[PDB]
Amino acid sequence: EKFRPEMLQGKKVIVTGASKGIGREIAYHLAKMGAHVVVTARSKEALQKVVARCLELGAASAHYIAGSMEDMTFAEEFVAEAGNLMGGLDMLILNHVLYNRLTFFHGEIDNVRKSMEVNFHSFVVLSVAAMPMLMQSQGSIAVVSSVAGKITYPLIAPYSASKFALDGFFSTLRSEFLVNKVNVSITLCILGLIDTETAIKATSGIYLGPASPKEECALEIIKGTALRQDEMYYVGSRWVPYLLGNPGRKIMEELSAAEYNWDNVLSNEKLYGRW
């Protein structure tokens, strides 16, 4: 079941946080594959450059919409406008993340709140807004997370909380989609240190581990999502993913599914509605 760049030709993709870093590279790859893209971020000028580059690169079409993901109204309206621009949606790539730095936690409650809004709540709002289109196209969602969304590291409590939250929410959603045979795939991407300008500045002489290249990172995210994988690990080691992937949890989730009165659940109107 091998990946081929043709899996994305003509596809309608949204990439958030695409004015720089991994997101920008994700846009570029998609353009090379002849996909339709709508990129978003806060910076208009940066987004404009990305759109121009994507067109040169061979994108089927490329547009940008500028706004902050701290604003939930924008997140919601963005998905509608984007769907109009492309006439639908095959893939939703959730990549953006709030500015953060490395510091011991001292009581930055506002930082905790803002991180949860931008890194987490907006991912949920965007997904909800996109779900009708995704269900129609039987499309996919990439949820971009971090090694710090699977284990804990000093110096990034607010960030880690929001990335853990993503795992809890979207992993639960995936399980439901499976039980209800909804054919929208949800891929959780777990990234190690990636050599984006932002990550390198935040960590240079503090965290000493090696960084992985952003170009290959972005491609691996695209592949894993296209192939509809549950999780995609890009952490700079072929072994580390298994220490992160928690065999115990996968076993437990598989076994606990048998504890449900499915006879009832799948035939209970009150547990269902729609979007």
Ligand X SMILES: NC(=O)c1ccc[n+]([C@@H]2O[C@H](COP(=O)([O-])OP(=O)(O)OC[C@H]3O[C@@H](n4cnc5c(N)ncnc54)[C@H](OP(=O)(O)O)[C@@H]3O)[C@@H](O)[C@H]2O)c1
* Residues at the interface with ligand X (CB under 6 A): 17-23, 41-43, 46, 68-70, 95-99, 118, 144, 146, 191, 193-194, 196, 198-199
End-to-end CA distance of the chain: 32
50-69: contacts with a copy of itself (CB under 8 A): none
Rounded to whole angstroms, how far apart are CA atoms 163 and 165?
Answer: 5
Neighbour tally for 25: CB within 10 Å: 23
Contact 8, 35 (CB under 8 A): yes
Q: Contact letters (x/-) for a copy of itself, 141-180, by CB under 8 A? A: -------xxxxxxxxxxx-xxxxxxxxxx-xxx-xx--xx
Burial profile 219-244: b = 16 or more Cβ within 10 angstroms, e = fewer: bbbbbbbbeebebbbbbbeeeebeeb
List CB contacts of 11: < 8 A, sequence separation 6 or more: 30, 35, 36, 90, 91
H/E segment holding residue 49: helix 44-57
**Could you say whether residue 239 binds a copy of itself (CB under 8 A)?**
no
Q: Total residues at the site for a copy of itself (CB under 8 A)? A: 103
Q: Determine whether 159 is an active site residue.
A: yes
Ligand-binding site membership of 52 (annotated): no
Q: How far is the CB of 246 from ligand X (least distance, A)?
A: 18
* DSSP 3-state of 233: strand
Is there a binding annotation on residue 16? no
Instruction: Tell me: does residue 128 bind a copy of itself (CB under 8 A).
Output: yes
Q: Of 69, 72, 75, 39, give the one whose Cα is nearest residue 54.
A: 39
> Six-digit token pair at 59?
């994108």
Q: Does residue 209 belong to the site contacting a copy of itself (CB under 8 A)?
A: yes
Which listed range, 3-11, 54-62, 86-94, 191-199, lies at the site for a copy of itself (CB under 8 A)? Answer: 191-199
Piece of the chain touching a copy of itself by CB under 8 A; list 11-19, 81-89, 219-227, 258-266: 258-266
Cβ distance to ligand X smaller for residue 43 or 180: 43
Q: Is 224 annotated as a binding residue?
A: no
Binding residues for NADP(+): 17-43, 68-69, 95-99, 159-163, 194-198
Residue ranges of the binding site for substrate: 146
Which residues are the active-site residues? 159
